[PDB]
Amino acid sequence: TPVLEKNNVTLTGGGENVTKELKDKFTSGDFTVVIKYNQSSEKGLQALFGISNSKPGQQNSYVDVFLRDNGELGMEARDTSSNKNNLVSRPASVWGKYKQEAVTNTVAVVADSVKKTYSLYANGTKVVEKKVDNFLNIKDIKGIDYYMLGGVKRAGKTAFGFNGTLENIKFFNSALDEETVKKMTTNAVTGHLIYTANDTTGSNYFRIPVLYTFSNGRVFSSIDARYGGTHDFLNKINIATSYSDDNGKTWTKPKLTLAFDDFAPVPLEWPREVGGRDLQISGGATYIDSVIVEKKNKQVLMFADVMPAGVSFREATRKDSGYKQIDGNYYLKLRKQGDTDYNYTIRENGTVYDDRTNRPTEFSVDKNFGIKQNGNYLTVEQYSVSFENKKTEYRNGTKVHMNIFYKDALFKVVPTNYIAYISSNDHGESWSAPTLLPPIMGLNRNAPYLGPGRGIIESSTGRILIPSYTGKESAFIYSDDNGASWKVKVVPLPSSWSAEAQFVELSPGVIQAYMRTNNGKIAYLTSKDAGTTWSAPEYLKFVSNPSYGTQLSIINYSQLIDGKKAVILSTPNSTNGRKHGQIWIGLINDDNTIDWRYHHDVDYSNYGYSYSTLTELPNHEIGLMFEKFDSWSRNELHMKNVVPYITFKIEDLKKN
């Protein structure tokens, strides 16, 4: 039961006094406030409400909940005389606008005196809970005399004035429990998540969404389910998938499609504070950065990077592919426990050979990288993770198959990165066992790193193209035999670009690779022979990003726009961070230049926008999934429920 409920309060910075209605209602001093609002302007710091001592000198005696122009939700509780100042917040908590309309959000704050915590909720997620030593409730702050909607009265003046409509606001004079407030804050925004914290995947975190529309009208998604927070590395990451047969309206419960079981797919509460956020899961085999393509025969391919347990992308050797060539064939090498050298290879039928004697052993490696001895699986104990802000990785008593990618294996692969792929003949419902890519970069180089998103089938040749990169070169992985065998075109770049790329076809035989650079710009290279040879890079003139850059998404679109063949591009566009997401429409001219005629700002310019993926829906609308946060910032690590799915008509995308 609310002590006060108000509704449809429209404000333009000036606030509304509710002192009469609330003074003396908070007898314990605890509170819960639930606010459903939309903003008419996002600029500045804006308080949804404010409870204060308004007198001269008591400016630092107040409680509020606030929004920032970047989507951060926070609260303060401050007392002037005792000089105590609490601030609790989480980045990337709310939405601003969506297709020209202010987004309705629902947030809440819970101040619990017994356990000395402030909790904040936004759109069904408890975005933060913090225990504080200097806890303050309404009665702890001396001389509270003013209760206000849409600001805080400080020294007789409205501060932090809110611009928007408080659609509904409820004040409660007790700390309401977690599940009740989650439910109260659930709304239409909550529904835009395909993957949610601790869903079927067992993961609390996701990054690197990929969308793809199959030829039968199924809309497919894949994502990194990152268990040990959002770290690229070290981590325990699986690839999860989910699909829609109704144009993206409803989605299957996620499946784990590429996963190792040296660690279980269980939810971990990863620390976000400065002293814990650098912590990593260190002992766990990983799939990361997925790429999808549909072949002409309707078979689907998914590629991902593979990292053995404990192997850092930074530290890992770049001068060993992990393969040995024997009588013209390439076989994966292994080192047995107790040996310094790699004396063994995986040859026909997974049989492990001792290369010194050239004889098969009693050991074999199955199609899922599991080790057998005389037909029986070897096992190891699985690891769990425990926190007590020290983290422990410990053996949990469950036996799993010993695997060549695991820390505790009898036979191990070379500690480097690999690429694996799997195929599906039923539009993504079931998948083959993984195949590791052969040493296409050479025996004495590591595999490339995939550029997440999609691959393409170039139409004139039927060549399958998969984007990847080395750190110094582009590596365009391809097959001219419908995916039976793979080759690579390696293209030196102007600098050390982390060249995450995507392809478009402009006209038959003519393709472009758009990619991330280390110079602030998006580069594109052009091939007029279906990827065999590439021009020097050119740069988009209208995107300006930080030097580190971000992944992009670009797709071909099937319908004419203004009479012309089109492409559609998604990227952040800001020098200040991974922010200011835009979708751009490019119209192909007869000379194969592009007229980049339209752009659309996805939300307000300070709102986070990192890795993204576009797809054309069967109805010819556009689906977008994206990281609605800044995935470079160390302040925005390890956040839950921050990778939404939204959609746009071309008519929406023409606006901005």
Nearest to 149 by CA among 10, 54, 2: 10
Torsion sign, CA atoms 438, 443, 447, 448:
negative
DSSP category for residue 191: G
327-332 own/partner pairs: CB under 8 Å, 24+ apart? 330/438, 330/439, 330/443, 332/404, 332/413, 332/436
408 is catalytic: no
Gapped junctions in the chain, after residues (C–N > 2.5 Å)? 388
Tokens 């819970």 sit on residue: 110
Cβ atoms within 10 Å, residue 387: 13
Q: Which of 418, 611, 616, 627 is catalytic?
A: 611
The beta-strand segments (E) located in 408-463 are 411-412, 418-424, 435-436, 449-450, 453-454, 456-457
Nearest to 192 by CA among 246, 251, 245, 133: 251
Strand, helix or coil for residue 266: coil
User: What is the distance between the alpha carbons of residues 437 and 320, in angstroms, rounded to a whole number?
Assistant: 14
* Beta-strand pair 379-387/391-401: antiparallel
User: What is the distance between the alpha carbons of residues 543 and 334, in angstroms, rounded to a whole number?
Assistant: 46
The beta-strand segments (E) located in 308-440 are 323-326, 329-336, 344-346, 351-354, 359-365, 371-373, 376-377, 379-387, 391-401, 411-412, 418-424, 435-436
Tokens 């590591």 sit on residue: 446
Q: Please say whether the beta carbons of 93 and 73 come within 8 A.
A: yes
354 is catalytic: no
Q: Which experimental approach was used here?
A: X-ray
By residue count, the chain amounts to 656
Q: Please say whether the beta carbons of 47 and 160 come within 8 A.
A: yes
User: What is the distance between the alpha carbons of residues 384 and 406, in angstroms, rounded to a whole number?
Assistant: 14
Angstrom CA distances, 571 to 45, 489, 522, 551, 602, stand at: 26, 26, 9, 7, 10
DSSP lists the bridge partners of residue 571 as: 582
Per-residue buried b or exposed e for 9-41, using 16+ beta carbons within 10 Å of the residue's own CB: bebebebbebeeebeeebeebbbbbbbbbbbee
The domain ranges of the chain are: 1-190, 191-318+416-656, 319-415
Helices first, then strands: H and E counts in the chain: 3, 51
Tokens 């996002």 sit on residue: 42
Rg for the chain (alpha carbons), in Å? 27
Phi, psi of 218 (to 5 degrees): -70, 135
DSSP lists the bridge partners of residue 387 as: 391
Strand, helix or coil for residue 129: strand
User: What is the distance between the alpha carbons of residues 434 and 421, in angstroms, rounded to a whole number?
Assistant: 5
Tokens 């395909």 sit on residue: 194
Nearest to 121 by CA among 160, 96, 93: 93
User: What is the distance between the alpha carbons of residues 324 and 413, in angstroms, rounded to a whole number?
Assistant: 12
Residues 6+ apart with CB under 8 A from 589: 564, 595
User: What is the distance between the alpha carbons of residues 94 and 280, in angstroms, rounded to a whole number?
Assistant: 27
Architecture of domain 191-318+416-656: 6 Propeller (2.120)
Angstrom CA distances, 555 to 152, 465, 512, 570, stand at: 47, 14, 11, 9
Angstrom CA distances, 105 to 180, 213, 345, 637, stand at: 17, 30, 57, 22
- The DSSP line for 594-608 is EEEEEEEESS-TTSB
- The DSSP line for 542-608 is S----TT----EEEEEEEEETTEEEEEEEEE--SSSSB-EEEEEEEEPTTS-EEEEEEEESS-TTSB
User: What is the distance between the alpha carbons of residues 110 and 176, in angstroms, rounded to a whole number?
Assistant: 7
- State both tokens at 98: 């969506």
The type of residue at 393 is E
Q: Which of 69, 129, 167, 232 is catalytic?
A: 232
Q: Please say whether the beta carbons of 209 and 625 come within 8 A.
A: yes
611 is catalytic: yes
Strand ranges across the sheet with 4-12: 4-12, 163-172, 31-39, 105-112, 117-122, 125-131
What element of type H or E holds 651? helix 650-653
Phi, psi of 525 (to 5 degrees): -110, 145
Nearest to 122 by CA among 107, 109, 110, 104: 107
The type of residue at 224 is D
Nearest to 417 by CA among 451, 375, 448, 440: 448
Phi, psi of 61 (to 5 degrees): -115, 90
264 CB-contact burial (10 Å; exposed 0-12 / middle 13-18 / buried 19+): middle
Within 13 Å of residue 414, how many CA atoms lie on the same side as its CB?
A: 27
- Topology given in CATH for the domain delimited by 1-190: Jelly Rolls (2.60.120)
Q: Please say whether the beta carbons of 536 and 513 come within 8 A.
A: no
- State both tokens at 77: 């509780």
Cβ atoms within 10 Å, residue 479: 19
Cβ atoms within 10 Å, residue 374: 7
Q: Please say whether the beta carbons of 107 and 73 come within 8 A.
A: yes
Phi, psi of 610 (to 5 degrees): -115, -120
Q: Please say whether the beta carbons of 634 and 214 come within 8 A.
A: no
- Topology given in CATH for the domain delimited by 319-415: Intramolecular trans-sialidase; domain 3 (2.40.220)
Q: Which of 30, 79, 305, 500 is catalytic?
A: 500
Tokens 């590596």 sit on residue: 475
In Å, the largest CA–CA distance within the chain is 91
Cβ atoms within 10 Å, residue 44: 14
User: What is the distance between the alpha carbons of residues 617 and 212, in angstroms, rounded to a whole number?
Assistant: 9
User: What is the distance between the alpha carbons of residues 140 and 117, in angstroms, rounded to a whole number?
Assistant: 14
Tokens 């309060």 sit on residue: 9
Nearest to 211 by CA among 630, 640, 634, 621: 621
Cβ atoms within 10 Å, residue 397: 8
